[PDB]
Every structure is written in C-alpha cells, then in structure tokens.
C-alpha cells in the first residue's frame, strides 16, 4: 500500500446458508482498536493486596475468607486482543436465527486480520490553561504483533473479567494487559484455633525457586507494521464437539416408561395409579410398586456439596457442581436460590450496559433446566428398600454427598449470548475434564492462538537507564481488527404437534431496552443459548 | 395373498453355529397377539393421584414419600410391541447354551414382522340370558401399523412394568398401551417445618406452558393393512458392546501379588505372613506392611449413599450405586440385605408365573458377585497412615460417602434372563453415562424403533360429535408377530484344572418348578447371565 | 387388490427442505371419511325462508334487513370433499415452522386420492327395545367418485361455511352435500315508503326461464370404486402468486425522506423539527412545511363506506373495503371497533373447537397491519391548501368517500392459518379482481378440480317410482382420503439489529389451550401469516 493506501475493509455482517440438514453461519466482525503506550515497556513480576472485604479480623469466623483476591503475577508490556465472547460475533437478531433454526451447532476456523494502523504522537505548547494540544502521526513509527500459534504462552483468554472485544459494530474497542500467573503459595486455615472457629493465614508468598517466567520476545516472532502495513493470522481450524441448542426437562421421573394407570372419565378426573402391577423394583419392593422406586438405566443429574470452597496452594476457589434449576423448589421470588450453579455476568458499555459509568449485571439461574435438578439437602438415603418403611434411624436427610457416579447423565450450560466465552483451553493433565463448567467448546488440541499487540517504544533524543517513560515521546494507535469465525449448526425442525415458544428477550424486560436511546444507549439481551424444550431419553 | 392365503409362518426355534473362537446365536421368536379396540380414539393428557401407600399425614415423619406415584402423561391410542425382553426369545436351555459356552456375547441385527391378521366385530342377537354373541370376521377392516425407525417419539420400551411380549412360545400376547409422560413439577420438601422432620408439597403441577405433545399420525408414516396383508419391518443393526458372561470374585485384596508368606508344613498348619519384607505401602508405614496398606494401581468397587432418594422435578427416585453381593456380610439367613444395588421382579402368568390371577417374583441379590461389594457403613477413614495407630479421633467411620473416582473399577449386573430387559436408549446429554444400573446392552445410535399398533375405528352407521366408544363397532384383531435377533458370541474354554459349577437352575428351587403342571401351569427359572467365575486382573 | 388388501397408507407428516434461499414444503394429510347414503337420489331446485332475524315489521326502520339469508339452489346427491382450509394440511408446529423461515410462500402443485373403501349395510333383528342392528359389509357395493378437471361445475369450494376437512388427523371427516346457487331475484327497498324509513321487498323469486341446471352426470365423467379399489386425481400445478409473511406498519408518514429535526440533547429531551428549510409541499404552502403536506409519490391505504351493505340482484351483501387494524383508534378495550374489514372465524370440533356440541369464535381484527388503518370518519379535506388555514367552510369532516385511486398501495389479509381458505376461483368477467378479500391466492388458469363422493344406490327386491328411500338399502361408506400440496417459499433472514418477537399463540391466549385434555380436547391457535414486520418502501 503506502501511506494513503487503506490495507482493509469493514465487514461485521453474519451470513446464514441452509443446504439439507446443514446450515454455514459466517460470522464477521470488525473492531476499532484504540491502543495506548504501555505503561512500562518492561517485565514486572509482583503479588498483590489480599483484595476489598477480606477479614482482617475472626468476627465472622472466617467465613469472609472468600472474598481472598491475593495471587502473583508478571506483567507484560503487550496487550491481548481475544474475540473469546459470544457477541463480539453475533447481534441479537442473528443469534436469534441461530437458535431457533439450528438443533446444535459447531466451531469450523476461524480468521483474523489487523489493518488500517495509524500510530500519532501527542506534543503539547503552552503552559497552564493556555496549554495546546497537538495530535501529529508519526509515519515511521511501529506497532508490534504477536500471534502464539504454538500455544507457548500461558493462556488468560478466558473471557471471565470480560476482557474481551465488544459488542456493538460502532463502538470503539480497549484493550487490557496481557498478564499471567507465577507460582505463589497462598493456603488460609479455617480450622484454626481452639474449638476450630478461627481462620489463619499458613502460607502466602511468591515461589521464586519453582517460577517460570516467559517473554513474549523469546517465546513467539514478533511483526513490526508501519501504517501501510497489514497482518493477517492464517486460517485456524477448530476441533470441538457440537453444543446442544435445546434444553432437558426431563429427569429420572419424567424418562422411561409410564406408571400403569387408569385413565380418567370426566373433565375433573385424574389418572389412578394401578395397585397390582408387575414389574422391576429396586429393594425387596414387591408390593408398593412406587414409580419412585422403579429400577432405570441411568439417572440423571447428580447431587454435590454446592458452594464447595476448596481452599488451594493458590486459595479458595469454587468447585462448581453440576447446572440446574431452582424453579421447582422456588416458592417464595424474592429470596434468590443460586444452587444450581448458577453464574452472574457484570458487564460495562462496551459489553452491553447502556450506562456509562456504572455497571449492569445477569444473574442466569437457568430456569429451562430441569428434571437436572438435585439440591443436596433435599435428598435422603435408606439403610435397606424393602415392603416397609424404615424407622427414625436407617433414614438420613441432609447430607451433601457427591453422588456424581458411572450411571449419571448431565448436561452443561450451553452458550450464554452476550457475556459468555465461546472455547477453552484444554489443562494438560492425565485426567482431562470431561466438560466444561462454562465455555461451551472445549479444544482438544490447542485453542485459537493468542493475539498481542505492542506499541514500539518512541524515545526522545536523551536515552537514560534510570529513565522509564520520561524516556519515551507520547504515543497513541488506532487500527482495525477484522475477524470471522464460520459455524456448522444442524438444521431444527418441529417434533411436536403444539406450538413451541421460541427465542426471544428475557422474561421480565421490555424492548425499550435493547433498543438505542435518544443518547444512544441500550443493552443486549441474554440469549439463553438452550433454547427450547427436547426429550432426553 | 388374499383372504385365504396366509401370509407367514411360525419360527420359535434358536439355532447355534460355532466357528473358531465365534459363535452365532440366531433367536426366532413368534407370538400371537391379542388386540382390542383403543379405549379412546383420542389422545389425552392429564396427572394422577399420588399412589398407594403414600403419607396422608406426618406419623412416620414423611420416609413414607418414597411410595410417591404421581406423575403426569401422554394418553395414546395405539399400543405397542417391544420384545426388549430376555425370555421372549430364548427358553432356559437356550439360554443355558448361550452361558456355558460363551465368555461374552453382542447384539448383532434384529428383524420383525406383523402377519395372518385377523380382524372380527362381535354382534349380539337378544337380550338378557338369552343375549347370543356372533363374531364375524370383517375381511376389509384395517390394522394400523407405526414403526419409528428415526427414534422420533419419546422411548418407554424399558422392560420396567414387564410390559413386553410373554416368554412361553403357545401362549397368547397382550398389548399394553403406549404411553409417555409430559413435563410436570413434583417437589417434596421432606425438611420443613421445625425441627426439620416434617415433609411437605412444594410444586405438584402439569407444566404446560413448556409442554410437548408428539402423536403419531403426525411423526411417522403409518401402515393400513388388511386380513391378506403383512408388514416387515427390515434389518436394525445393533452397535452395542459387548457384555462379560462371568462374574468376579476379586476384591482388590484378591488382585495383585500375594503377601510374602511362609508355608505350612503339615495338613492342619496354616501360612505365615512374613514379618520383615521389603514393599510399596501407602503411608510411612515401613514395618507393619499389612497386606491392607500396600499399594495397587487400581481399586475395585466403590461406596455409596446405598438407597440414596434424589427428590427431583419429577418427584423422588433412586439414584442406585453399584452392585454387587452381600453374601460376605450376610450371617443370619432370615435378614434379607438389600444394600448391593439388589433389584426384584414382580411377574405374571405370561412372564413366567405359574400361577394366575397371582404374581410371583424374584430378588436377585447377585450373590456371585464379590470383591465389588462395599457396604459404605463398614468402611473407615483415618487422618494418617503411618507406623502408628490413630487415636479415638483422627478415626471415623459411619460416613457414606460416594468413593467412586478416577482409580475405580467396578462391573455391571449383566443380563437377568427371565424378566431383564435387553437394550436401552441413550441419553441425549453433554456427559452419557459410563455404563447401565439395568440393560446390559446401550444403543450408541438409536434403540431398535418402538412398533405401535392400533385398530382402524370402526363407525356405525351414525357419526355423532359427541360419541365416543357408542359410536365405532366393537371390534377386535389376532395377529402373529414373528422377529429375529442374531448374537455374537466368544467360545468359552476351560481356564481352570479343576471343575466348574455350570449355569442351571437357582439355588433353592427344585426341578418341578420349571416343568409344566398337570394344569400346564410353571416357571421360568432366574438365569444369572454372570455364570461361571473369571479373573478380573 | 382384492377384498382382502389395503389399497393405499397413511401419511400426516409434513416436509421441509433448505436449500440456499428458496424452502420447499410438502404438506402430507390423511383423512378417514364417514360418508352416508343420500338424502335423495335426485336433484331438487328450491327457495328458502328469509332467515333467522329478518324483520316482519319495520320497528327497525329496516336496518335488520342485513340478517337476509334468501336464496335458490340446486340440491346434488353428491357430497363435496374440499381441503381448501390451512389446517387441513399444517398443524400449529408447522404452521410456525413456516411463518418463522419464510418471507413469502406460493402454491407449487396438489396431488390426492381415495382408498379402503368400505361400504357396510345396517340390519335391525326384532322390534321395540329387542331391536338388534347389524353391520355388514357388502362387497359388491359401489361409490361413486366425480372430478372435475375442467371446472364445468359451479364453484362453493370456498370454505366460508367452514365446510372441509377437519383439522385434526386422528378424527373422523363428515362431508356436506354439494349446492349451488340458481338465478334469483331478492331485491329489498330500504327508502320505500313516506319519510323514506320503510324497507320493503321489490322482488323475492326463483327466475326460472333464465335457470341453469348443471348435473354431475352429464357434466363429468364418474369413477365407481369397489372395496379393492382406489383413485388418483392425478397431478395438479398451481399458478398463482405468492403471499407476503409480513405484515406492513408503514403509513404514508412513516414512509419517505424523515422532516429534518434538530436532536435531542439529553436524556429526557426530544428532537425538534426545524421551521426554515426546503423541500416539496402540495399547495401553496411554504412556510409551514409541515410533514403532513410533504408530498409523496404514493399513498398507503385508502377510505370506505366502511360496512358498505350492497343491495344487489340476490339480496344484501357487503362491499368489504381495505383491510387494516384499529388498535391505533383503540383507546378503550370493551368497545370492538370492527371497521379494519375484520373477520370472524365461528367453528366447531373437527375444526378447532375444544368443546362438541357448542362452537367457538375467532374475531381477527387484524392488529399488527398499521400504516394502512383509514377509518373515513376521522379524514377530512379542504378547499384549498396554502400558508393559510380555511375558515369554517371550506373545511369538511365525515364523508366516507372511497378513496382508492391511481397512486394507492393496500395489502391484503394474507394466510389465516386455522380457518382460512387457501385459493380462490378467479370471477371470469371483463374486468378481474385485482385482489382478494380472504383467500391469499388467486387461481390464474382454474381453481384445484372439485371432488364430489356419492354411494350409489342400494335397491331393494322391489323398486316403486313412488319409492323414494323406502327402496333402498340403509347404507354407509368410511374410506381414506390422502392429499399432498407442495410449497415454494423464500428464505426469511434477519433484517435488522434487535430481536424480533417471533410467531407464537395469540397473545391472550395460554398454552393449556391448544393441548389435548383429559378427554382429549382442545383447540388450533390461530396463527396471523403475516407474523412478523417489514419495511414497505
């Protein structure tokens, strides 16, 4: 190209291509990438404050020793660009065509571009109110880029903490540091102390002897574009299993064949249950003959300690049992179950929230997914299953046990529109997880490499080491981030006499949300992503 | 054909072919079915009542609602035939065939077909005692005929209820109807009220909003056949996998290799474990090196919350556990343990009852199987393992606590000849389950499809609206079903010098049993499909 | 075939296949058809009464003289099977299926045919409440089947009258006997009289030397069908055009250039238009530029003598005018404003109705179509048009003058799924209609052939010319009807950024509707066909 020479295009319309069964959906996507000089052009390695509402004292036990933030980390002087969410792809209507006109769907590759880079220097006359800005581009200067293909760097492109390309085509897109974890210890006590009531700190400290530190200079080759220069990723081809569109109602109870019954006669009549039936029981059960006590292939859902803290060398974590939802149990509305495993997206104006300056937030209780549904307390185990009933012993209620075994079946979320990641490192480990607690793709063999992105440092004419940024002239960039992904969906068609509700807003909202402002501001909707009803076995 | 030619033949007899280290089992299997007008030419959907021998009050504290029937349904018209049991196709020395000489057997291919169909409408001349029944055959009546190949509809052909077709080749079948459940909310708090022992209803509802309701007219094609008519249902190819006709004895104390031991010397002397050895323990144990604590690869079986209730949407169920034998705990012989994930048929004259108008049945409390059995009140944990012996605490031991992980190895029951079904579906879900509580045999792709049937109605000369049954001619139909399923086995040969006990009839019982009666009246026997013992590692 | 062999199958199930942006939908349907023995054996030519609520006085002033139901006809033996309604083919799944991933649709081709045929006479035994009946099934007997390909018959396919096929698979059709209309005079004077209040009649008769008498046996070529007998009609093709999915909320000031507006500044604020700017006015106007007199090249929608009653030749009609919604004019919800050129569906079992013996009701008031509601009350004109307002005169209100002209655009209702009639006979008149009041499509080159059944005449021993049913055998047929009509639509994409609300049931209406009951009621939603919005121009 050259200077006056634009090296790209904008393109962020998603095609849809129904053939038989199979339906294309090319997702397009452009970014205006505001980029700023790193604030240090070095390598820093630190730990940091335990975090806000963490007890500095035993008043609540130790019970607020989850809100432990601590870790350590090295700080990069790149920036990461990942289009890891749902809805830096897909506008809400075009994720609506996806799940209602597709059963489930798969990653197929995905491509990338960088172009239209202009790189200005901010000089400054005057003093005082007087003071007069000047914005000049330099055309010699560099932006640096690096793709690990290789997947040599640690991977943080999670979309948790929604550092991730936004979603609104007009908007401009900022990006955060690339940064990673050391190797710290960190492992707090809540047994301490006499009666076990006090929590203590153990060990917390960076682990210098066992840590390793990575460079992106060392790791992966670095590009250096001027302003009429483009990038280009190559192709990057997915190996995933498809995602579900559709959600289960159906549990244990709702699965196989039917109680024997008497049907009814009139309007106001039900069913009768058959008292002399024949058929497989579990226990020595001959007579009762309980549905509940029908002997099945397999069972579906499982029971876990919910809320399991699991206090770790790096602190406590969650571990997060299975998805499901509290409707069946709710009762009251205003007190909020969240045992389902349930997950909440805060998010800002660029990922959705219509108000600048403060944040909005998704609470998905996954109400479609029942009959997955266990809540621990509820359930209870006998000593022996027999013609009769236990006694006050031999009967245990509240108990917590996982009860995730060889016969169970599950489900996992499923996409989860606007905030949701999209696919998941792989952990290298003997035993690799059998699904994912959030992202609905897992890669089996490496995840789409990581972009970083840097501003070559611009130095004034005195170069001094004990100088950082004193150094180096101001210097900003903007440029153009083109991506597309293409997805394989499997065309859905009605199983069923009736009507099916199909996708659309969340149930309480309106679409005065959802819709521009007369300032311009308006949410996206969550999306489900598990849409409508289907039979599980 | 036409009216006078028949249109099939009747084929009860099985057939062995032993080539090498294969053997071909081909079942034949042909059954004369009774079958009535449909209650209803309609389809309905309603809920029940809660079942017998469910709690009205709280005097037993609510362990009473493990008898809970409730559910709600689909009420179809047609009916359906599934030979998914064991025992439809082979007799017991058919079977005895398959177990003494195979180590494992697979679902190969299953055919069936539908001919001679017989259709007559019975008419009654008078009244009172001098009422005379006529039945004439109607030879343009039609039978209706759906087959699902694409596994469209929701599957209920679990053997649970025993509802398929009767195992003694001369006697007559019965349909039952087809029938599914619908989505409903049944949630039973057993944890309410103060002090927590009183139970109560949460959600008892049919849940229509999110409702499917899938006839038949409008999913599959359906056949109209008349007298001179058949209908085959071409080839289904299984792919299963395959299931192991022995049992083990081998616990993990059974396994590996022995403790160093000391012979005897003469005929009532025993072994002596040898004190000082050298070994892998599990802890800093280095002089105790009990047989307990050395270290193995893998462990075999594992605990559970035995009889574990999940309260789910759909209502409680039974979550199973692992099965396995009680015989090593058993003692007294009139305490009958149930906690080895032990099922019980409850069977009728057609499914291997002798007796009519009574039913008999079966526990089957897998006693072969040891070395898997883990009763989970009998197990302990202890804080360390080490030279030294815990103290009081440090200790503990009633948990019930669910043990199966990433080391265990633990087998299923196998097939249950008599009433055990033979396939299942599979659950659609992110994680299908490892393996089966019941069907010895998971379809990977689609269960053979469901064969429904109905009668055309048959109308009278006035067709009212509001008539139901006063308006269609009483009408019924004989018929002969004919199927072929094909298994392969493994050829079975001596591992052992000494003899084998081989497959024959249950314990207890006697051979006069099994035989038929002076009124024709017998047995089929119990069958353990898990025969002969084996070596597991 | 032959007494004993089924002459044909039965499929329900409808197709959808995707292909680029073109979607073909084959509708399969099949129905079980109860036909009875002729009223008559011959052809009659009557008048009737007046009607049900027809005025003997003139209490009303003769405004009741609308409640005229007089006519003349020609009564066939014959019996007509039309399934000219939506819903004899689609159920609501896939009627929804349709409207969600079409933009329009047309009508491709028709195939149908008639097989298993039985024909049973009824015998009584005895007298009094001895009375024994007896159904048998005489072999020999034929029925009688009449198409006509060239349309040389009279045309009442039109399903008002709700007269087709049921809509429910699984139920029994009842036919009504084919009629048509003879030449009549029914002319009513609503001046007549002093004062000009008075209705009276002109002219009330059959105009016999003008008649037209049309047989179907010597008109028509007739099939006679034994039991082992079938018909084909033989291929049908369609050419129509096609029918818009949309519906249209565009008024002719929602349409063109927007008035330039100054925008708003804060949140609460709103846009002001701006006062001095240029562009096309109508008349003189210069100044005001008001958006109203902003000249167009069209105008959507037009006026009527809304409930415009024709008092014709045969009697009373209405005159229907443009159809459009009145929720804009709503205000109050008791108050039904009719006047969009509403329609209202009265039905009963077969077609919808949850409830035998009494019948439900539909009024389609057409509420999504906006942008073409006229009301003629609410218009007004002007003498002139200038910077200057008109005076009391010069300015008139409430007139009701037709309005369409040269630059109008109108729609049409489009598909009204449950009870709508597909096509349409074209009027064969110099001028032909440029559009339809009801049926979407409008056939070009011959409406789909009618197919009249009739059982032929079953005669005893003696056969009197005084005889009228006295002489034949009490009979009756059920036989099978199968259709297939295919569609061509084009694929629906998204057009815009947010979230569509996607088809679905009527909006106050619940899901507990709709499903079966426990007796097996329940009832079609009514579907729009114009479903979702689209921009006009």
Redesign the interface.
Known sequence: SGVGHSTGNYNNRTE?????DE?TIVCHSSRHIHLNMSESEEYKIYDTDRGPRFPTDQTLQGRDTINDSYHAQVETPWFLINPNSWGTWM????F??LT??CREVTLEHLDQTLDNIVIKTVSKQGSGAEETTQYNNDLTALLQVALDKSNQLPWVADNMYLDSLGYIPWRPCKLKQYSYHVNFWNTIDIISGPQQNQWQQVKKEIRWDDLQFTPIETTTEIDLLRTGDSWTSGPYKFNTKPT?LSY??????????????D??N????????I????????????D????????????????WPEWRIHYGSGGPAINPGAPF?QA??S?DPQVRLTQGASEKAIFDYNHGDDDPAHRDQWWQNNL?I??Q???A??????????SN??S?QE?????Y????????????VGIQYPWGAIWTKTPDTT?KP??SAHAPFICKDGPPGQLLVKLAPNYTENLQTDGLGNNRIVTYATFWWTGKLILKGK?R?????????????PRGTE?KK??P???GHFEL?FMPGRCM?????
């Not at 506008?91 to 075009?94: F, I, K, L, Q, V």
């Not at 008292?275 to 001959?286: K, L, T, Y």
Request: aromatic share 14%; charged share 10%.
């Open positions: 849809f291509y129904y053939h038989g339906v506008n809400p209507a075009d609506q065509q209602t006109t579900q289960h109602w159906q549990s244990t109870r709702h699965t196989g064949s039917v109680h024997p019954t049907p009814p009139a309007i106001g009549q039900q069913g009768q249950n008292r002399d039936i024949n058929g497989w029981q579990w226990g020595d059960r001959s009762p003959m309980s549905a509940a006590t029908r002997v099945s292939n397999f069972h579906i859902g499982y029971s939802s069946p149990w009762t479609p029942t009959g549904t266990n809540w307390p509820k359930n209870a185990h006998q000593a022996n299953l027999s009933v236990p006050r009967f245990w209620t509240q108990d046990h996982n009860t995730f075994g060889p016969f169970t079946a599950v489900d996992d035993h059998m699904m065309l068609l009605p199983r069923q006499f009736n009507l099916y509700n199909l996708p659309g807003r679409a959802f819709l402002n007369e300032i909707p009803p289907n039979y599980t076995m």
